Design an enzyme around this catalytic site. Structure first.
Site, PDB file in Angstrom:
ATOM      1  N   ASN A   1      -7.660   8.232  -5.877  1.00  0.00           N
ATOM      2  CA  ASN A   1      -8.575   6.796  -6.526  1.00  0.00           C
ATOM      3  C   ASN A   1      -9.395   7.583  -7.649  1.00  0.00           C
ATOM      4  OD1 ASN A   1      -9.403   5.821  -3.121  1.00  0.00           O
ATOM      5  ND2 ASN A   1      -7.746   5.047  -4.464  1.00  0.00           N
TER       6      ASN A   1
ATOM      7  N   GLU B   1       0.964  -1.243  -0.010  1.00  0.00           N
ATOM      8  CA  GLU B   1      -0.074  -0.100   0.044  1.00  0.00           C
ATOM      9  C   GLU B   1       0.981   1.011  -0.147  1.00  0.00           C
ATOM     10  OE1 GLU B   1      -3.021   0.099  -0.710  1.00  0.00           O
ATOM     11  OE2 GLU B   1      -3.906  -1.716  -0.264  1.00  0.00           O
TER      12      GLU B   1
ATOM     13  N   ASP C   1     -12.475   7.449  -8.229  1.00  0.00           N
ATOM     14  CA  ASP C   1     -13.901   8.109  -7.818  1.00  0.00           C
ATOM     15  C   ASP C   1     -13.788   9.421  -7.263  1.00  0.00           C
ATOM     16  OD1 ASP C   1     -12.759   7.451  -5.410  1.00  0.00           O
ATOM     17  OD2 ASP C   1     -14.505   5.853  -4.686  1.00  0.00           O
TER      18      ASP C   1
ATOM     19  N   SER D   1     -11.989   9.992  -4.225  1.00  0.00           N
ATOM     20  CA  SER D   1     -11.460   9.772  -2.979  1.00  0.00           C
ATOM     21  C   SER D   1     -10.172   9.865  -3.068  1.00  0.00           C
ATOM     22  CB  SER D   1     -12.219   8.553  -2.405  1.00  0.00           C
ATOM     23  OG  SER D   1     -11.835   7.245  -3.059  1.00  0.00           O
TER      24      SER D   1
ATOM     25  N   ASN E   1      -9.205   4.831   2.719  1.00  0.00           N
ATOM     26  CA  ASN E   1      -9.925   5.533   1.768  1.00  0.00           C
ATOM     27  C   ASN E   1     -10.755   6.597   2.507  1.00  0.00           C
ATOM     28  OD1 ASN E   1     -11.608   6.230  -0.360  1.00  0.00           O
ATOM     29  ND2 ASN E   1     -11.268   4.186  -1.378  1.00  0.00           N
TER      30      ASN E   1
ATOM     31  N   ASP F   1      -6.744   8.103  -0.766  1.00  0.00           N
ATOM     32  CA  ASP F   1      -6.136   6.673   0.232  1.00  0.00           C
ATOM     33  C   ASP F   1      -4.909   7.446   0.975  1.00  0.00           C
ATOM     34  OD1 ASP F   1      -7.908   5.016  -0.685  1.00  0.00           O
ATOM     35  OD2 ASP F   1      -6.269   3.836  -1.889  1.00  0.00           O
TER      36      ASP F   1
END
Ligand code: NA
Length: 129
Positions: free
Chosen positions: A46, A35, A48, A50, A59, A52
């Site tokens: 992301n 990650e 969409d 959003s 998220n 991280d």
């Protein structure tokens, strides 16, 4: 903060992630490696819209508030910025809620794709825990 592998393993164990919801410490260290490369300050946008945040790339769509993720929730009741601190308490506490949500560590796509089913104990090899 860029954690060393065993350094992060020790911190995760101290915070009760070892075998949390049945996931051995190596699963959590493996997830953090893919990650964040063990970097608390890691952020990634992301598709969409959003973001991280932190060692476990939590998220803003569900878990933390960053003020710029429309229609999102803040189920860990934390500013996403708290997930970038050198102190991993907020990340760990929030990860415990995520992994408890019903799909276990599949919540972390990198865990599913890179750690799941692999020799995850290798990630804690040589560590004094
Ligand atoms: Na949010």
């Amino acid at each position: 903060k860029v954690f060393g592998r065993c350094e992060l393993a020790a911190a995760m164990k101290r915070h009760g992630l070892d075998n949390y919801r049945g996931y051995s410490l190596g699963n959590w260290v493996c997830a953090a490696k893919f990650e964040s490369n063990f970097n608390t300050q890691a952020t990634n946008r992301n598709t969409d819209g959003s973001t991280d945040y932190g060692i476990l790339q939590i998220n803003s769509r569900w878990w933390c508030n960053d003020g710029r993720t429309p229609g999102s929730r803040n189920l860990c009741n934390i500013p996403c910025s708290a997930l970038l601190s050198s102190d991993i308490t907020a990340s760990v506490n929030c990860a415990k809620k995520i992994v408890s949500d019903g799909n276990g560590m599949n919540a972390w796509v990198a865990w599913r794709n890179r750690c799941k089913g692999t020799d995850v104990q290798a990630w804690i090899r040589g560590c004094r825990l």
